[PDB]
Copies of this chain bind each other. A is one copy, B any other.
Amino acid sequence: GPGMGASQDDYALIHKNILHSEDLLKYILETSVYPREHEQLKGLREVTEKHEWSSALVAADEGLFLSMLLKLMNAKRTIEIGVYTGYSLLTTALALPEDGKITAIDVNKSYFEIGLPFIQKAGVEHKINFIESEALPVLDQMLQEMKEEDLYDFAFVDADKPNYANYHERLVKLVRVGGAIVYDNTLWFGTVAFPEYPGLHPEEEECRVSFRNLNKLLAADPRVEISQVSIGDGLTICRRLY
């Protein structure tokens, strides 16, 4: 409608955690994450923590885990769907080798412009091709243009959660055999464990439903092998088998 959309202040889940206690998550961040966090990632996180959609920001411990995965698999060409202010994007660009290439897709370039100065200061702007667009049309055009030699090593999916199953049908063809697709937020604040969950915002309830469907679909999908990981808000790593 012409009015203002829902704000995260209208959401019921934003103060929820999947870990046992706030103290345990704080321990992980202070002990194992902040001492290992790039100065420009720390700056980007601190600005984003103030932003109207801060609850969408990828967790910082999850960021270091994505970095580790990219380095262990020697990824060099990646795609990111859902950029926001650029925390996972800057994480990825810092992790890739100097000639690494990232295709980054978001509908909102104004969000990306918040993180862009941090990306520039980190020296990794040259690795990023930012596409201001809804992701599905971009992915569908890639299916017509891209050749086998151009396939992606790694995909991070963190945009509009109800569309994940649709993204999957494209990305399992756009990531190479043996490549990885990582879907963020697949435990959705712990709500996926319940067939009914009271008092959610309609937009939060739509994601509870879509993630329960997606988690079943990925578990049954013979094109990939999976690992669901209780880090951050949950993520699911998919490895393409054929």
| A17 cross-chain contacts in B, Cβ below 8 A | 20
Tell me if A225 is interfacial: C-beta within 8 Å of chain B. yes
| A190 cross-chain contacts in B, Cβ below 8 A | 20-21, 23-24
Shortest Cβ distance from A42 into chain B, in angstroms? Answer: 15
The residue in chain B whose Cβ has the minimal distance to the Cβ of A68 is: B227
Shortest Cβ distance from A228 into chain B, in angstroms? Answer: 4
Chain A interface size, as a band, is 35 or more
Complex Cα spacing A23 to B189, Å: 13
Tell me if A209 is interfacial: C-beta within 8 Å of chain B. no
Number of copies of this chain in the oligomer?
2
Tell me if A54 is interfacial: C-beta within 8 Å of chain B. no
The answer to whether A71 and B36 touch (CB under 8 A), given A19-B20, A31-B219, A193-B21, is no
| A194 cross-chain contacts in B, Cβ below 8 A | 23
Complex Cα spacing A229 to B59, Å: 12
Tell me if A67 is interfacial: C-beta within 8 Å of chain B. yes
Shortest Cβ distance from A35 into chain B, in angstroms? Answer: 5
Contact of A65 among B35, B71, B215, B229 (CB under 8 A): B229
Contact digits for A208-236, partner B, Cβ 8 Å, 1 yes 0 no: 00000001101110000111111100001
Tell me if A73 is interfacial: C-beta within 8 Å of chain B. yes
Q: Is the CB of A228 within 8 A of B28?
A: yes
Q: Is the CB of A216 within 8 A of B24?
A: no
Complex Cα spacing A220 to B227, Å: 29
| A68 cross-chain contacts in B, Cβ below 8 A | 225-227, 237, 239
Chain A contact residues, CB within 8 Å of chain B? 17-21, 23-28, 31-33, 35-36, 61, 64-65, 67-69, 71-74, 178, 180, 187, 190, 192-194, 215-216, 218-220, 225-231, 236-237, 239
| New A-B contacts (10) at CB < 8 Å, excluding given A65-B229, A229-B231 | A18-B24, A20-B21, A27-B192, A31-B219, A32-B228, A69-B72, A71-B225, A71-B239, A72-B178, A72-B180
